Amino acid sequence: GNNYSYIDPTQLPYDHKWEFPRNRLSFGKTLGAGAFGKVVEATAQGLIAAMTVAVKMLKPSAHSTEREALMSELKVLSYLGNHENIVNLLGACTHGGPTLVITEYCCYGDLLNFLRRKRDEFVPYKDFLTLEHLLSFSYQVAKGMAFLASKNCIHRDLAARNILLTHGNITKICDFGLARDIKNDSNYVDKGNARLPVKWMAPESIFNSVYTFESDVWSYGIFLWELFSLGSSPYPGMPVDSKFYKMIKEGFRMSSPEYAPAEMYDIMKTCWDADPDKRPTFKQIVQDIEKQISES
Numbered sequence: 001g002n003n004y005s006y007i008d009p010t011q012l013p014y015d016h017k018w019e020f021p022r023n024r025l026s027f028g029k030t031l032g033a034g035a036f037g038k039v040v041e042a043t044a045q046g047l048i049a050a051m052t053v054a055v056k057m058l059k060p061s062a063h064s065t066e067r068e069a070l071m072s073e074l075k076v077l078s079y080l081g082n083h084e085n086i087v088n089l090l091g092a093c094t095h096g097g098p099t100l101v102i103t104e105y106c107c108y109g110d111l112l113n114f115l116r117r118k119r120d121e122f123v124p125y126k127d128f129l130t131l132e133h134l135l136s137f138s139y140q141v142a143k144g145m146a147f148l149a150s151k152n153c154i155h156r157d158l159a160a161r162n163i164l165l166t167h168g169n170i171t172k173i174c175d176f177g178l179a180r181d182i183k184n185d186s187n188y189v190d191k192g193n194a195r196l197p198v199k200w201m202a203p204e205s206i207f208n209s210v211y212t213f214e215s216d217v218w219s220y221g222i223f224l225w226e227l228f229s230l231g232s233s234p235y236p237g238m239p240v241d242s243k244f245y246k247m248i249k250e251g252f253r254m255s256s257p258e259y260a261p262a263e264m265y266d267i268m269k270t271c272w273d274a275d276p277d278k279r280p281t282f283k284q285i286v287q288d289i290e291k292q293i294s295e296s
């Protein structure tokens with residue numbers, strides 16, 4: 001009985017099959033900077049000639065616990081494996097300097113800014129943005145999240161800003177700094193003291209700091225609202241304050257975006273069930289969207 005346990009991927013050794021020499025890595029422009037650190041475009045010569053990649057790194061002032069967390073994220077990505085709809089791990093630099101995590105590069109950037117740029121040219125039916133594209137995006141994000149859940153992982157920051165768009169209109173979930181394997185407890189209780197994405201969070205995460213497969217599903221529902229509203233900020237007209245929390249707890253939910261199909265707003269509503277047990281799984285969401293695509 002006690003001779004069997006769940007292998008914790010963050011306790012496994014770093015596998016040097018990922019190691020890439022930093023003297024073949026040339027940094028280009030900065031792609032983003034924030035609590036996650038710094039992300040740059042780069043060329044990784046000979047990782048496969050020259051492929052364009054993204055490289056995540058910490059600020060030079062970073063704490064030892066920040067540095068350990070980047071190593072832990074590397075181990076999580078190493079254990080997770082490859083999927084079409086995530087920003088995949090390609091390599092790392094783990095000695096001779098600060099840790100660098102090398103991942104796929106997505107030339108169109110984040111989906112939120114993409115949507116906000118294409119808002120004015122959007123037309124529901126027929127390059128330009130159409131209802132068909134938005135359904136495809138909903139499907140691909142659900143497939144990436146189903147994959148994470150099939151590996152017993154939660155992302156904890158699902159939002160349009162953390163979805164990237166690459167060639168062929170393929171969407172990829174990015175930023176795994178907060179992702180966790182929850183095989184042992186079937187939840188995660190956040191002990192951190194960082195700023196949190198309150199308007200994307202399930203009420204049980206706000207109130208009790210508990211994260212689960214089902215709280216990722218809540219966030220997916222908020223993502224759907226962002227998507228079909230073409231990049232509107234969620235809960236318009238509502239600051240994050242005592243009024244906001246009271247309303248969410250009492251059962252307030254956002255109305256449908258104008259261009260959301262009724263069956264997609266139906267998914268949103270089940271993602272936001274107050275009872276986590278009544279929310280759908282990503283597996284169920286994928287099957288639902290599949291059938292909507294086929295019926296279109």
Ligand SMILES: CC1(COc2ccc3c(c2)ncn3-c2ccc3cccc(N4CCC(N)CC4)c3n2)COC1
Pocket residue numbers: 031032033036039054055056087103104105106107108109110161162163164174175176
């Ligand atoms: C639009 C252009 C392209 O932009 C980009 C941006 C990030 C790009 C990118 C192309 N390929 C990849 N990544 C990544 C990769 C890992 C990341 C790990 C953590 C955080 C990230 N980001 C993106 C979203 C987040 N909300 C803010 C920081 C990350 N990004 C073409 O010139 C910019």
